Ligand binder design. Structure first.
Ligand SMILES: OC[C@H]1O[C@@H](O[C@H]2[C@H](O)[C@@H](O)[C@H](O)O[C@@H]2CO)[C@H](O)[C@@H](O)[C@@H]1O
Length: 255
């Protein structure tokens, strides 16, 4: 059903779930080489062998974020048809996400396996800005650090390979053009199956930002989307070779 070999977006449906996949190289000015993303009905795979890389904005650190998502991504003003997102955070009872993944990459490549959402003041913004929140959940990372500084750590459960684990998550916060929160699992998992509820993270982000001058009414913000992907690169990265595979995907939003 879906095949992309250049930056772009496409909707598709997986096990009845409407989704969008983006071959996202947002911070790459130019590159040579190959990129291929594909959805075959049963799994999503991504592969990259690119060279002559240079960032558009070196200050942003990473170079790209090939991914697929459920919902409405503000920045692209896009959503596949039939999505249940966006919804106000305060209306989320639980949001269970499950996926099996396998990531491979050249050893020195700054890379991570990250999931995130954008909490916007208004339902359908086309950007995030002061008053909004970007929240990431890193299940894996390699020669990559989240932006900002570490503030606290949280113990948050998730089911690894079918076994309930009590993960230890560092929380990184930065206040740039928007509020940035990144939950980094202290024991990265490079291949496996995870199941967890986004709500726990939301609860934690809420407490962390409870004294912010910028973010005003946390529970009132719109939970717009859930992205799943891998960020890569750094301003010094000149070439990149890595790839991944996602499978056994399923979600459950309870309003
Ligand atoms: O800056 C707009 C750009 O953001 C991309 O998400 C980035 C985000 O900017 C950055 O703060 C965070 O560290 O990483 C994410 C994912 O790489 C978004 O994917 C782009 O569509 C958007 O144009």
């Amino acid at each position: 059903m879906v095949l992309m070999t250049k930056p772009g977006t496409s909707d598709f449906v997986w096990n009845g779930i409407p989704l969008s996949m983006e071959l996202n190289l947002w911070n790459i000015k130019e590159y040579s080489g190959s990129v291929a993303m594909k959805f075959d009905g049963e799994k999503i795979t991504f592969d990259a062998d690119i060279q002559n890389l240079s960032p558009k904005e070196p200050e942003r650190g990473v170079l790209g974020y090939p991914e697929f998502y459920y919902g409405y991504k503000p920045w692209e003003n896009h959503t596949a048809e039939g999505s249940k997102l966006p919804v106000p955070v305060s209306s989320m009872k639980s949001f269970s996400v499950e996926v099996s993944f396998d990531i491979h990459h050249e050893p020195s490549l700054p890379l991570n396996f990250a999931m995130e959402t954008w909490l916007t003041r208004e339902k359908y913004q086309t950007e995030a800005s002061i008053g909004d929140v970007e929240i990431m959940v890193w299940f894996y990372f390699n020669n990559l650090t989240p932006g900002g500084e570490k503030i606290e750590e949280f113990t948050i459960p998730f089911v690894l390979n079918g076994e309930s684990v009590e993960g230890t998550w560092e929380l990184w916060l930065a206040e740039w053009g928007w509020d940035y929160l990144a939950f980094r699992l202290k024991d990265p998992v490079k291949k496996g199956r995870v199941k967890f509820d986004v709500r726990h993270f939301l609860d934690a982000a809420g407490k962390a930002l409870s004294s912010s001058a910028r973010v005003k009414d946390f529970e009132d913000l719109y939970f717009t989307v859930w992205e799943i992907g891998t960020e890569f690169g750094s301003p010094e990265t000149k070439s990149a070779q890595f790839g991944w595979k996602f499978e056994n995907f399923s979600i459950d939003l309870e309003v």
